[PDB]
Write a protein that binds this ligand. Structure first.
Ligand SMILES: Nc1ncnc2c1ncn2[C@@H]1O[C@H](COP(=O)(O)OP(=O)(O)OP(=O)(O)O)[C@@H](O)[C@H]1O
Ligand SMILES: Nc1ncnc2c1ncn2[C@@H]1O[C@H](COP(=O)(O)OP(=O)(O)OP(=O)(O)O)[C@@H](O)[C@H]1O
Ligand SMILES: [Mg+2]
Lengths: 197, 341, 135, 173, 397, 280, 167
């Protein structure tokens, strides 16, 4: 009886299920999924000097995304790595033999899931949306939901996604539930699923 | 005797019971099993299932089963069916990378250390037909780097990034039963902390139990080697090396340890039970731009034959992609001033 | 809401398990030519556990003072009169010296480093890096 | 691309898999009588200077093989014609060249053996052989007229220039 | 746009076109070469010449820094720029924004090397590295009434010919295609034809003569045999004469100019005449590229095939290309109605007067507009954000 | 190329082509060219009223009025004579060439057109060289703001003319590289004692009470010209050199940073070969 | 000198000790792997920062960790000209950090240049050879900064004579 965060290619959904069925009420939807990230990568890769046409290279960038993109944990941190070092740079070979290099865009592209305005979408970010979806739900069932969030979908495989959500939900809680009691944060039990299959 | 399987590191290795085949991880998500033909090495197998770099490999002697753990958080138990090894997924219930794994001597269970700051003890339930595990958590504060079982398949030694060498009880009652009293203690309920080193420096890169398990040794990043025997109130002997950190260690007799690491060559350490002191009678690899057989750090060492009680041959795989077989007696002939025990 | 480092309150974080020579004695030997005795005197009871950055430096200065009074050719002798644990503590002190260049001190410390390195080996340095409790 | 023959009819006979096309000539051979004012030898000479530069050529009719043959033969004539002085000398030079027994399809020496079928029996052989010699005769003759400027003893440099070039990088020598 | 016009430089394989924005023609078109001496002490680095002044120089060695549009020698390219600025343009680099061009598929790293030179060495206040195809399309607005930055650009210079599809100002990299035939190949082919027929041509002037013949007499014909026949018939109205001076003896040598007039450019449509490794007719290559592009942009492409470069100046070049490309398309759309009614395809090859320096011209025009100073990366941004900013250049116009 | 050239190549070549075709009796082409020169100079070559038989060459100097107070007009008239015409709107000096009335030898007028800029400057130098040659002391120093934020000061004395430049180095490091060159000019007379004496002064202006600009990026070069330099025989060459000094200095500072690069490219390349050598 | 060799020997030994790295998956982030010395999100995995100083100017800062080492060098800058020549040279290489793979795009505050050597580097490059490079690098930059300085001076002289001798 837990909440499922299923993000595939077309759209991302947050579905709370209780002891058997999904409650159409409370369920939400974010207009930012797999494809949106792929297209966002293309934009980032053009600003870097690579000639990617949105319609002719979509499939190509998608593979770049799937092989190289990941979710940053602490963006300010991920940013410093990209600007101060070269540990993030990876070489990718395109269908024509040309070899491009990808760095900061590896985490920047997926950051859209958390910051929609980046791809000019009005919203709050799958994370903050996951918080509001349960903080509205029954006050008895909450603790259980918070500890049964399972990730589903192709676009939920980004390395470090689970850890990001957990850091986000924790951040919201500390401000929108504990008001700022650092000492009570320890009681916030958050267990995000993410199974192999 | 040196052989280069590749130029990239060999993350870890494991040999079958007869020492006929060896399984290594060539810095991959894969495990390659090699076999000797005449005086050459022929790749006979490829185990492709992990989705991250394989960090630990162990081979149960008698059941001929292979266990592997990876950075993808998974753990697989490989069984041989005809001419192909089939993997069975084992859920460690961890959210960080698995760093090491070892079969218990009784082969009824295995332990996996991970970045989740816990040790997953796995055993199979012939009722629901699958593998389950129980966690040893307290007081592990960091990543578990290495593991080594006690001859009784219950006690377990673990080395971690919180600078501590520990021995816990991994007592599962549903596969074995009531461990006989040991010098380490009489009460061994699951997870019980039996011993913990006192040093507050250096990651414990490798740990090892002696043949009778009454002594345990470990090598830390602060270039020290240590030994503690339960027959002397768990008194610990410490030796500060003058060289680079050691990454792997094993007993070759009850009073002799052979280690290797960043210097790239194996060394010898002997223990004086009487004085409770450790000594260095090292350097077994006596004569790129180095004078050692291995060109990069040695990260694993295993007893090939003769057990840990009277080892005649041992193996070393390293970050140079090399595997080296050493003959304990040949080393004693070449170095007439060498001890052992 | 992201300006807060929740990790700082994570109960899986790490926490380490949380003094000084004797001037009168050290100065005694110093103003007596007994260099080798001055060294050992200063190398005794390092503030390895006191929180005060002050008492630590108080000790580092006294040690540094001795290393300076030393004459180029009198080092090896006083370096070889220490037990491996001493050479170790010396090496930790030499590096703390490197952090406060002054005159030719930073040049003499380089001579010591050379001596201590031959005596204690590169592992005496490794132990400077790995120390959690230090000078 | 290259230029192909348009003299192929549904009622055109074959010798091997070459087209036994009509030719306006006073030379003897199995060649049919000609009705139209232009034969297969006219095309070859008309298209020569252009065709000679092509390296690849697609065969569309058995007619193209006869075209190809004549084209390759012109290259042989020019090699000879180049080094002689006077239209007359050149006419004698061309009788001799057309009388020499060149390699026919099927024998080593003949290039393009993978494209030309060899005479199926001894009769075809005699005919094919007689036909090709016919063309060599009636080709080196006309060619002799085109090559020499009304200022005899002058093999037009507008023909001598194609001496080093080979149609389809092939040669009858 | 301030008092002084921006500097515009199109560095090509064979020729560098340079000048000031707003002008219709480059103020200088010079060979892309630098002659040097060969541990450098003193100022030996300054001892050099470029352009014509460097092609022969007795005691100096001629070097060509640009191979196929790409910069192979940055040390030399940088010095070349030293004289482009202070000797020819006589511009105080710190006072003018600069618009430099780049080969298609130039890497992002190269743009940085170029920017390092312009900001670290010459201290330019602003820089813009343009994509030649875009400038060419802009130059075509000159005509042949509705501006657009979507089209197929056929740039044929001296190195290699490029067929570059452009959608709304952005090159479709994954679909670019090359053709091993360019200006230098046509010259070289004409040289052979001349060696095979005309005596008296000075060996050490074989290419020079061919080049002059290529630029003063060549053209593209509609049909080979018919062209060949015309010459062999009315020879007096087609064969031309050319006379030159022997660099030695200074004696006048004259020759006849014939078939090469149309055979030279002909290799664009029948590559096999002079190349053993390439055979695709340029018309097909154009077809092939447009076919590989996004279906929905294919029509826009066929309707705007623009020409650019010295080697596209041959008379009727665009006519022959259009016709040939139409045949291939039309024939292809025939097998459909047959196999099965696809709306017809409108193929249009645009030729305009500015073609020869299409790239520089388009560049001069765009650098004359106010938007140019908005899209250039300023020196300040260069120092505060870093060379990375020069990897991307906002398309505009 | 060490010394910067005095003449403008666009002017000379543009005219050369036009005169050549006129001389061959060809139909004149329309010409329209805008281009610049050092020190914020702007030029324009056009066909007045679209009359292709006429070619006008105009030059715009934001500080022309200043040179005008020091004989520019009189000098330009002496040099260009009847080629000189009323200044085009937006410019200070205009030269007009009638393609239908040119001299037998065009080289002289073309050469002179090339030196339009130099001829505009020449004036303030001839004036004060004469002041000294006569003895006229105490005459007000000339002040030419040849650049928006740079200034030249000419002054004549009993036996020496002094030209002083107030130049600016936008780049903080160019100032440093600048001092190295100035240091060598300061010691120039060690290789030739007759040559002018050069002085330098960073941040602070020579003592020679004005709106003198002070700053970490401003230097003051000073050439002291002697009679052997200012007399009627050496006068013109001296001018060809001195009026280009400022641009000559910044040109070399910049060519130095370009040489440094070839070095940095070479060392960097070396290092990279070594690291790759470290690979198994 | 007299003090050069001692300094570099002391720096070489310290690098020998620090460049003892192994692959380390992240303890903080699922399926991540970052250079611990940069992120610093696990105190136990960071070693003690140390400094080797030749004098008051030239010094080296070595920051080791379980899987990476950051090495910062304070290059010798005798005067203004050496100071700007150094700055341009260091910037020139940092701009090319990707080709160096072991160079940091920016210096640690207080130093002129910085390296970031990871376990991945010591895996594909004999660590002893890397210890060699850092020392070879230190020696060769001081030299280059010396030739440039002489080159700049040598050319300033010719440029001044060239101009002055024409009057
Ligand atoms: N390893 C990966 N990392 C990130 N994204 C991935 C990965 N693999 C696939 N994707 C993306 O996941 C999306 C496809 O996932 P999936 O097939 O589950 O969605 P779907 O069910 O087909 O569509 P929907 O969920 O909207 O109904 C695509 O955007 C694909 O690029
Ligand atoms: N009128 C002309 N007809 C045919 N070719 C010409 C004509 N004028 C110049 N050319 C040729 O144009 C070529 C140079 O053209 P262009 O300057 O565009 O090439 P480029 O830009 O230097 O080379 P690239 O574009 O490959 O970098 C030379 O082969 C020159 O001979
Ligand atoms: Mg070009």
């Amino acid at each position: 009886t837990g909440v499922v965060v299923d993000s595939g290619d077309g759209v991302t959904h947050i579905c709370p299920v209780y002891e058997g069925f999904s409650l159409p009420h409370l369920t939400r939807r974010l207009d930012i999924a797999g494809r949106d990230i792929t297209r966002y990568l293309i934009k980032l890769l053009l600003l870097r000097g690579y000639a990617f046409n949105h319609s002719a290279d979509f499939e190509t960038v998608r593979m770049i995304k799937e092989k190289l993109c990941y979710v940053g944990y602490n963006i300010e941190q991920e940013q410093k790595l990209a600007l101060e070092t070269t540990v993030l740079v990876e070489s990718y070979t395109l269908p024509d033999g040309r070899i491009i290099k990808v760095g900061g865009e590896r985490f920047e592209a997926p950051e859209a899931l958390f910051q929609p305005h980046l791809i000019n979408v009005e919203g709050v970010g799958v994370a903050e949306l996951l918080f509001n979806t349960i903080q509205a739900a029954d006050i008895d069932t909450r603790s259980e939901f918070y500890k049964h969030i399972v990730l589903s979908g192709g676009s939920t495989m980004y390395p470090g996604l689970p850890s990001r959500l957990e850091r986000e939900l924790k951040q919201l809680y500390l401000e929108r539930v504990l008001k700022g009691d650092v000492e009570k944060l320890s009681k916030f039990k958050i267990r995000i699923e993410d199974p192999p299959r | 005797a040196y052989h280069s399987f590749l130029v990239e590191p060999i993350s870890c290795h494991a040999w079958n019971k007869d020492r006929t085949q060896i399984a290594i991880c060539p810095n991959n998500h894969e495990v390659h099993i090699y076999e000797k033909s005449g005086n050459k090495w022929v790749q006979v197998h490829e185990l492709k299932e992990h989705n991250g770099q394989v960090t630990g490999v162990d081979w149960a002697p008698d059941s001929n089963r292979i266990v592997t753990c990876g950075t993808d958080r998974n753990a697989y138990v490989w069984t041989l069916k005809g001419r192909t090894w089939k993997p069975t997924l084992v859920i460690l219930r961890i959210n960080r990378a698995a760093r090491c794994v070892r079969w218990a001597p009784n082969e009824k269970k295995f332990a996996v250390g991970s970045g989740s700051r816990v040790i997953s003890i796995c055993y199979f339930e012939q009722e629901n037909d699958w593998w389950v595990c129980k966690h040893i958590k307290k007081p592990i504060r960091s990543t578990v780097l290495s593991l080594d079982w006690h001859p009784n398949s219950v006690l377990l030694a673990a080395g971690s990034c919180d600078f501590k060498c520990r021995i816990f009880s991994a007592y599962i009652k549903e596969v074995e039963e009531r461990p006989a009293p040991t010098p380490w203690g009489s009460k061994m309920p699951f997870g019980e902390l039996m011993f913990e080193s006192s040093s507050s420096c250096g990651w414990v890169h490798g740990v090892c139990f002696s043949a009778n398990g009454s002594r345990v040794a470990w090598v830390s990043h602060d270039s020290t080697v240590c030994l503690a025997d339960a027959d002397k109130k768990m008194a610990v002997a410490t030796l500060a090396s003058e060289t680079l950190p050691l990454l792997a260690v094993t007993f070759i007799t009850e009073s002799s340890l052979v280690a290797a690491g960043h210097d790239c060559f194996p060394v010898l350490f002997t223990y004086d039970s009487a004085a409770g002191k450790l000594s260095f009678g090292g350097r077994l690899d006596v004569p790129a731009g180095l004078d050692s057989l291995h060109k990069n750090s040695v990260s694993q060492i295993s007893v090939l034959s003769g057990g840990k009680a009277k080892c005649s041959q041992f193996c070393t795989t390293g970050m140079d992609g090399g595997m080296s077989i050493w003959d304990v007696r040949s080393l004693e002939s070449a170095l007439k001033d060498l001890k052992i025990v | 809401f992201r300006k807060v480092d929740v990790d700082e309150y994570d109960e899986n974080k790490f926490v380490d398990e949380d003094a000084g020579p004797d001037e009168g004695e050290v100065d005694s030997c110093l103003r007596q030519g007994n260099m080798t005795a001055a060294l050992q005197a200063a190398l005794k009871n390092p503030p390895i556990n006191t929180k005060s950055q002050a008492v630590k430096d108080r000790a580092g200065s006294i040690v540094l003072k001795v290393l300076i009074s030393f004459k180029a050719n009198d080092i090896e002798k006083a370096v070889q009169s220490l037990d491996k644990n001493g050479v170790d503590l010396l090496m930790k002190y030499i590096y703390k010296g490197f952090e406060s260049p002054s005159d030719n001190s930073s040049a003499v410390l380089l001579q010591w480093h050379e001596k201590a390195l031959a005596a204690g080996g590169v592992g005496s340095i490794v132990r400077v890096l790995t120390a959690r409790k230090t000078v | 691309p290259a230029y192909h023959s348009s003299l192929m009819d549904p009622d055109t006979k074959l010798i091997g898999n070459m087209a036994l096309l009509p030719i306006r000539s006073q030379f003897k051979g199995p060649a049919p009588r000609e009705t139209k004012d232009t034969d297969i030898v006219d095309e070859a000479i008309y298209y020569f200077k252009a065709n000679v530069f092509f390296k690849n050529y697609e065969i569309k009719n058995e007619a193209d093989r006869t075209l190809i043959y004549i084209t390759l033969y012109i290259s042989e004539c020019l090699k000879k014609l180049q080094k002689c002085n006077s239209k007359s000398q050149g006419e004698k030079e061309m009788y001799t060249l057309g009388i020499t027994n060149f390699p026919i399809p099927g024998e080593p020496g003949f290039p393009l053996n993978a494209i030309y079928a060899k005479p199926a029996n001894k009769q075809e052989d005699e005919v094919m052989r007689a036909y090709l010699q016919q063309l060599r005769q009636e080709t080196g003759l006309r060619l002799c007229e085109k090559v020499f400027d009304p200022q005899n003893d002058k093999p037009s440099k507008w023909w001598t220039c194609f001496v080093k070039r080979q149609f389809m990088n092939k040669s009858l020598s | 746009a301030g008092r002084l016009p921006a500097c515009v430089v199109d560095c090509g394989t064979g020729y560098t076109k340079l000048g000031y924005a707003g002008n219709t023609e480059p103020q200088f078109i010079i060979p892309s070469c630098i002659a040097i001496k060969e541990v450098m002490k003193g100022v030996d680095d300054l001892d050099f010449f470029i352009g014509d002044e460097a092609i022969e120089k007795p005691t100096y060695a001629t070097k060509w820094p640009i191979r196929h549009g790409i910069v192979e020698d940055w040390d030399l390219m940088e010095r070349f720029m030293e004289q482009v600025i202070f000797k020819y343009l006589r511009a105080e680099p710190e006072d003018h924004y600069f618009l430099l061009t780049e080969p298609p598929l130039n890497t992002p790293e190269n743009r940085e090397y170029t920017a390092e030179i312009m900001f670290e060495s010459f201290n330019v206040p602003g820089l813009y590295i343009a994509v030649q195809a875009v400038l060419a399309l802009a130059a075509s607005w000159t005509s042949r009434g509705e501006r657009t930055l979507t089209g197929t650009v056929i740039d044929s210079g001296d190195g290699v010919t490029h067929v570059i599809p452009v959608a709304e100002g952005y090159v479709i990299g994954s679909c670019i295609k090359h053709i091993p035939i360019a200006g230098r190949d046509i010259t070289y082919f004409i040289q052979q034809l001349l060696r095979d027929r005309e005596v008296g041509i000075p060996p050490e002037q074989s290419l020079e003569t061919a080049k002059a013949v290529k630029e003063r007499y060549s053209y593209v014909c509609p049909d080979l045999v018919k062209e060949f026949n015309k010459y062999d018939t009315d020879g007096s109205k087609w064969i031309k004469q050319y006379t030159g001076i022997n660099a030695i003896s200074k004696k006048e040598f004259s020759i006849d100019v014939g078939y090469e007039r149309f055979l030279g450019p002909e290799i664009f449509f029948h590559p096999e005449f002079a190349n053993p490794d390439f055979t695709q007719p340029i018309s097909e290559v154009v077809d092939e590229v447009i076919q590989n592009c996004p279906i929905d942009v294919r029509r826009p492409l066929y309707k705007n095939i623009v020409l650019s470069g010295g080697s596209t100046m041959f008379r009727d070049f665009g006519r022959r290309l259009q016709r040939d490309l139409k045949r291939t398309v039309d024939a292809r759309l025939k097998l459909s109605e047959e196999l099965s009614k696809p709306k017809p395809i409108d193929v249009q090859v645009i030729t305009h007067h500015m073609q020869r320096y299409a790239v520089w011209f388009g560049g001069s025009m765009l650098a004359s507009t106010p938007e140019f100073y908005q899209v250039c990366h300023t020196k300040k941004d260069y120092e505060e954000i870093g060379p990375s900013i020069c990897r991307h250049n906002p398309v505009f116009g | 190329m060490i010394l910067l050239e005095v003449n403008n190549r666009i002017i000379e070549e543009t005219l050369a082509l036009k005169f050549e075709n006129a001389a061959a009796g060809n139909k004149p082409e329309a010409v329209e060219v805008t281009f610049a020169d050092f020190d914020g100079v702007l030029y324009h070559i056009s066909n007045p009223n679209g009359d292709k038989t006429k070619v006008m060459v105009s030059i715009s100097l934001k500080f022309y009025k200043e040179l005008q107070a020091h004989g520019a007009d009189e000098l330009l008239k002496r040099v260009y004579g009847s080629y000189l015409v009323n200044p085009e709107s937006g410019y200070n000096v205009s030269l007009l060439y009638d393609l239908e009335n040119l001299p037998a030898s065009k080289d002289s007028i073309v050469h002179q057109a090339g030196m339009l800029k130099r001829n505009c400057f020449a004036s303030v130098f001839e004036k004060y060289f004469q002041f000294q040659e006569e003895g006229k002391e105490g005459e007000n120093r000339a002040v030419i703001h040849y650049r928006d934020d740079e200034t030249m000061y000419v002054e004549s004395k009993k036996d020496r003319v002094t030209v002083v430049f107030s130049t600016v180095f936008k780049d903080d490091d160019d100032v440093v590289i600048g001092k190295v060159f100035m240091q060598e000019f300061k010691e120039g007379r060690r290789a030739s004692h007759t040559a002018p004496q050069v002085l330098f002064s960073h941040r602070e202006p020579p003592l020679e009470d004005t709106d003198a600009a002070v700053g970490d990026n401003i230097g003051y070069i000073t050439f002291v010209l002697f009679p052997r330099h200012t007399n009627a025989s050496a006068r013109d060459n001296t001018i060809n050199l001195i009026h280009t000094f400022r641009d000559y200095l910044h040109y070399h500072i910049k060519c130095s940073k370009a040489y440094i690069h070839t070095r940095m490219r070479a060392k960097t390349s070396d290092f990279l070969k070594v690291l790759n050598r470290a690979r198994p | 000198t007299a003090t050069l060799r001692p300094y570099l020997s002391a720096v070489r030994a310290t690098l020998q000790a620090a460049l003892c790295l192994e692959n380390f998956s992240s303890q903080v982030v699922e399926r991540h792997n970052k250079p611990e010395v940069e992120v610093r999100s696990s105190k136990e995995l960071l070693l003690q920062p140390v400094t080797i100083s030749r004098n008051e100017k030239e010094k080296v800062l070595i920051e080791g960790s379980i899987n990476s080492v950051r090495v910062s060098i304070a290059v010798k800058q005798a005067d203004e000209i050496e100071k700007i020549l150094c700055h341009k040279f260091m910037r020139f290489m940092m701009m090319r950090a990707e080709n160096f793979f072991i160079l940091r795009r920016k210096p640690v505050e207080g130093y002129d240049i910085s390296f970031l050597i990871t376990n991945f580097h010591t895996e594909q490059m004999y660590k002893h050879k890397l210890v060699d490079f850092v020392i070879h690098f230190m020696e060769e930059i001081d030299k280059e900064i010396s030739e440039m300085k002489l080159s700049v001076n040598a050319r300033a002289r010719i440029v001044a004579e060239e101009f002055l001798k024409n009057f």
